[PDB]
Design a binder for this molecule. Sequence first.
Ligand SMILES: O=[N+]([O-])c1ccc(OP(=O)(O)O)cc1
Lengths: 513, 513
Amino acid sequence: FTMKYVGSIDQGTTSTRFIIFDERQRPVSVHQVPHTQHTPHPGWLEHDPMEIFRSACKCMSVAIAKLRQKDASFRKIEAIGITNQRETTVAWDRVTKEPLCYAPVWNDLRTYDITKKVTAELGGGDSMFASKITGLPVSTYFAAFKMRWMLENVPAVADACRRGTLCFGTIDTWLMYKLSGGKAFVTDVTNASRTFLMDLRTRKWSPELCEKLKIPMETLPEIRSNSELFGYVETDECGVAAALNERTPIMGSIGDQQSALFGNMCFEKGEAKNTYGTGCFLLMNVGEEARFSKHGLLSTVGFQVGRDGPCYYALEGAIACAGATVEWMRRNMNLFSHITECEKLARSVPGTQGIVFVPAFSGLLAPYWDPSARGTIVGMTLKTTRAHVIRAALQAIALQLNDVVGSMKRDAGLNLSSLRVDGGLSKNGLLMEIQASLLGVDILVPSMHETTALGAALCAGLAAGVWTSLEEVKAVSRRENSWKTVSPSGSAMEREAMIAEWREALKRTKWAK
Amino acid sequence: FTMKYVGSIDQGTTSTRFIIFDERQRPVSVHQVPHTQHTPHPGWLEHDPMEIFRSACKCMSVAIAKLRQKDASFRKIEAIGITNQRETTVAWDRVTKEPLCYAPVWNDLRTYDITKKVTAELGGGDSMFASKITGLPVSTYFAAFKMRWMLENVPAVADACRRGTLCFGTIDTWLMYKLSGGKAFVTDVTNASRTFLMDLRTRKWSPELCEKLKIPMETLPEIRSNSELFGYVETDECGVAAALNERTPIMGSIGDQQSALFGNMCFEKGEAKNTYGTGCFLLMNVGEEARFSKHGLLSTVGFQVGRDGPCYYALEGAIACAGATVEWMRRNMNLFSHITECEKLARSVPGTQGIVFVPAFSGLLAPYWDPSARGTIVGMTLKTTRAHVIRAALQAIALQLNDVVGSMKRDAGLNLSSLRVDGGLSKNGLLMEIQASLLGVDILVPSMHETTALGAALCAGLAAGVWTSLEEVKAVSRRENSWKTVSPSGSAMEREAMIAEWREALKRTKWAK
Ligand SMILES: O=[N+]([O-])c1ccc(OP(=O)(O)O)cc1
């Protein structure tokens, strides 16, 4: 036949992208368009759903146009996948086809008072009351609470609910609705699991929770899998229908973290990925049955290939200050000037020589949620240098994931098979070695680092028959796009002593108030 | 018609100085010569006693010569005083007049085992067992224990004992021997009070403690006051006898910290001085009656002018890492480039904004004595910067001073009417201010900073009639050498709160072992 290509809309917190992959899973064209970060009051954050929609469209037409110019064999896009900042929630009207307000972002803290109210007046003091249904604690992040808040506080949303015309939806749902010309009102299992309205075990809306939270099941879209025919692109808001040329289907939708889980090929229980960004997000595949957490971790859907096909579940954990710690050392503390020196300063010394640096700046998340913990350094002497402090910060990040992973191993009754990394800090070689050594598993660094975008591309491709099974997907990746591999290179005396030092250090962190 | 001159040899840890003062207490010639800091094993420090002797002689020869050029009539120095790093101990031979080995320094930790063996076998587990005799706990610093080591470890010293030719002394005794040709084997009360071998109230060698620790009294110098004839300079080591031109008497000997107390005119009880340098010490004049300590602090002789003169006593508190702390931030952490950036960055913020830096790099001294304490910072957030960390360090220093003064008031039964400062960090205004605001008293700063050297010249000039009395001495100082006063400026609640913050941070310093 001819060459095939799959497009991936990568819709993030600070920008939107379109990446076209070829059938070897190589990114052959990209365009990025940012969008405005609206901040009406301290701790609020909101996005313009229409601005986001036009960025997607822009990106699609620019990347397309750039590829035609450099690839004589590119004829059309076979299918489009979507991946998105999760939890961000949009309200819009079924007949005007427009938003009723801006979109509160995942990390938006306006829903706080609703969240304290729900914990008390519905869970009787327990934030975990519905964690066996949803997999989730009561929290400001999850969508129901933002939905509730827009019902309570946006007269326009209240009204349209009463007309029977209101649509709520995560960014996947919204993007798919407009791309479709308003014909498709859908969502995938991974986005739907971050709403607080889906029953993990069935992956359907929960009549009980919707009732109990007073969100009407008329407002919610149809839950579908990650990989299947969602709709077609039927708009032309920035040249896009012209650019795609043929009608082009939408056949992949997956929340960003799960999209990275998928794009890093974590198809089997025990396989986990970590993104080393500003924070860390670690996800492990735990298998075909939902596993619930007794360490404060999130249970979520990992991925679902095919409608009502197999559903792999996952456990998710975070740390707030990974990349942010490195940036803090530089710009607040002058411990170095630009990012290259971070790793070389940390390599200049054989170890931390006693010190521990717990970068608990905005508390400890992970499996020891403690908002009172603060940034603390212990063990220093006159022989202590910035080299050691920088190295200890690398150890700290790796120690936290280790704790997170330890908790996941216990909640799930599995061992960690391998950890794939992506993110800025995955380019710090030393941090990968300290991590491999602590976890006692191989760490895998793909050199094609666009793993989030690839997840959604893989979903669309499987469904459109560009790739014909997960095994073919792994073969192509392992052959074409080369992984760097990083084996444990440390003794069990050192491992055990580093974790013991860390354990002792964590006791000394309590400070705020 | 012509100016009368007094000489001071200032034999410090890292160098030797000779200062010549006029009868108006102005330094008119100075010369300085550094000596080698030998460190055979880790935590060991050791000096070459011939190097030290010869350094002092070069200092006298050159300072003398530089003065003749400024003043061609100067025919002689009236008298020469000695002040010296204390506790540092020389072993020598009565007839060869030469060191048997190198001299272990005040902060040398080779005596550690011997320090334990003593606390148990002689002291029944109590380190304060001779507190009421010596004014001291059992510790690595004091000269007896170094004496003991050289008998158990140095063939030449163990041996020279047998023949009746072994001499031991502190650096005063050693300089003063060699300066005199061998004709003088003496020590002053302040230096003697640091041997662990002298009764504080009586200023006698204690036959009980000698006996107990296996130190034969045959090796020990005759104790004198700080102000009287010790001997004459009768050597030509660098033309020194010649340069002096006349037989010049040594009429001053005083341990370095006491010398600063004396040189800052701290004659009344409640008057205290805080010195920064190769080590950092606060000394309070407590009066004619000796006071002992319930809160770590050391009891010692302040000074005694003359054989039949009254003995004024003092309490002594140390801190271990003071100027070292600033240089550590500079040289190890790169928090600033040069010394003037420190006070500025610290000034650029309103406060510590919730952080505390306990700079206990080598344990907590003062009234806490915790050798397990290490350097620790607590409270940090992403809003913490180097300005806060540097400011915090300065607060820690004042906070430690404050806790040391607290202990001193309780022990002595007095308030601190005045604190005079000198050494390095006295040039930092912000620190002086933070210090004044915590002790709630005045801080005096000499423009004629050379006050340690002054003390021994004052001793030697009092004995030789250059000044006739303590009153004339203080009258001239006031007349000649200008002050700078720093007054408190804060609340009771600022103070109370900063101290409670500090007291909780201390709980989190235990780390070593
Ligand atoms: O890890 N984070 O806190 C985080 C994650 C995503 C962000 O934005 P994005 O990288 O454009 O999706 C910004 C910050």
